[PDB]
Amino acid sequence: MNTVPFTSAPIEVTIGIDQYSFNVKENQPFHGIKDIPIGHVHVIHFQHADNSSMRYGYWFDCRMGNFYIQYDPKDGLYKMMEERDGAKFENIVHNFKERQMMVSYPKIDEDDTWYNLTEFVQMDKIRKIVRKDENQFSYVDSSMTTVQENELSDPAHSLNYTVINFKSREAIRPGHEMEDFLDKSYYLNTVMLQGIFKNSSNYFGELQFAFLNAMFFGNYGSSLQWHAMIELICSSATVPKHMLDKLDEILYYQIKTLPEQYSDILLNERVWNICLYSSFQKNSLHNTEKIMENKYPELL
């Protein structure tokens, strides 16, 4: 089990670690988070009590380095940094742990929620979507735009999700206009899966990371990308059977975990109704259709 220690907590902040969150008061004696499970990526995120504008946070994997949070009073945020001196890091963590100034990652043994939300997410792929190669962790916030958004303005601070556009030359073979638009299998299997993502695991990884950036940061271009990647699968008549079965599990845990009071903005009526009720794969997502009908029958 690993640890994200904090230099201090100078400003009152709501702190989130994966799907959990807690409140720290201004200058409260707080020195971080312990018992973080190894083997998954994680995200630690912030919303200041004074300005709920800008949720921000940091995707990281403890297997890749020793990371800490230290507030910057010039830039006005909690910054993640790496301690390269491993002995100094262990001693500081051991001191905070003995003084019981750390909160405990509150994971119930029976709960595989985070695993299920992050099954295909890998830190190496996150770092290619979020380009900042001097750090081993990745900053995301509410306001960052995607590459596709920028086409429709700073490139260094963009989310480089794979561009997906149903009315593009990439998506439509010359001479198969009607065929390829009404059945996007070519675009899913040859262009994206075989061409760009290489396999379904990388595809699902980006799909799951987009969803999580939409949910934790209200990042609108991430939400767009999650929906688009769902719709591309659902709108393909020919999808490997293993991919359909896994998609159904993926989306089930995303819908299960979504805050009830955020469904009005985070869920696209048109995409979901088309996917569950009109598309080729309308019969293939049994778990996802059952939780959606029992939790959000309004949207449908």
């Binding site: 009315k167 593009s168 030359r169 439509i172 206009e177 009607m178 638009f181």
Partner: protein, 237 residues
């Protein structure tokens, strides 16, 4: 955006544009079978593609052989329309290609946009107007060439005849839409109006009679009476 009442004079400026109507591409007769079921039999159709400025009409005849062995024909018809429009554009010299294509029905927008991806600088637009182009098959010479066709064929017309020698495009298009609205509301009456005087003939190379300026005024008035009337006969007013 959409073409409507408020940007109407844009049709008559010097940017090349075309209207595309697909309402006559897929035409059927519905009949009973021996077993007492219902079946359709397709008849030839046409794409109605019109430059509203010059009057040039590119009438593509959709032969019934197009549909053989195909499913979902009303959905196919929209793509087939889009395939043919894009082939037309591609066939024209660059300086003759349109800058905008205005579709009369919103369901043509995606089929046409997809077929025209190679032409990002041609704007594909809908319209809020209720244009009467469906009645083009009430123009005898157009209906005739369509029904006689034994193969796909493109036929070229000037739907304004020689009107532009004497009136502006704006006035020609307004006359055209009035004639077509009339023909759509009461084809029999409309056609009676246009022919009642045997001395006014249709030139072999024209679609409509060779009315004088004064006779067009009378005709135009008679067609407006018809349209108002049928509105009373329909709504009882």
């Amino acid at each position: 955006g959409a073409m409507n009442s408020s940007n109407y004079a844009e049709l008559f400026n010097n940017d090349i544009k075309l209207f595309v109507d697909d309402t006559n591409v897929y035409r059927v007769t519905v009949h009973k079978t021996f077993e007492g079921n219902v079946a359709t039999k397709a008849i030839n159709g046409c794409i109605f593609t019109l430059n509203p400025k010059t009057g040039h009409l590119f009438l593509k005849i959709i032969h019934t052989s197009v549909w053989a062995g195909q499913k979902r024909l009303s959905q196919l018809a929209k793509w087939k329309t889009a395939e043919e429009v894009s082939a037309l554009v591609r066939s024209l010299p660059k300086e003759e290609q349109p800058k905008q294509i205005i579709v009369t029905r919103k369901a043509m927008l995606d089929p046409l946009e997809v077929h025209m991806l190679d032409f990002p600088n041609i704007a594909i637009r809908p319209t809020e107007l209720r244009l009467p182009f469906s009645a083009a098959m009430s123009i005898d010479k157009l209906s005739d060439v369509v029904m006689k066709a034994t193969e796909p064929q493109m036929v070229l017309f000037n739907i304004y005849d020689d009107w532009l020698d004497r009136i502006s495009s704006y006035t020609a298009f307004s006359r055209l839409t009035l004639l077509l609205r009339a023909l759509k509301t009461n084809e029999e009456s409309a056609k009676m109006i246009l022919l009642s005087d045997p001395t006014i003939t249709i030139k072999s190379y024209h679609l409509w009679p060779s009315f004088t300026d004064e006779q067009w005024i009378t005709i135009e008035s008679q067609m407006r009476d018809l349209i108002l009337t049928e509105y009373g006969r329909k709504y009882n007013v």
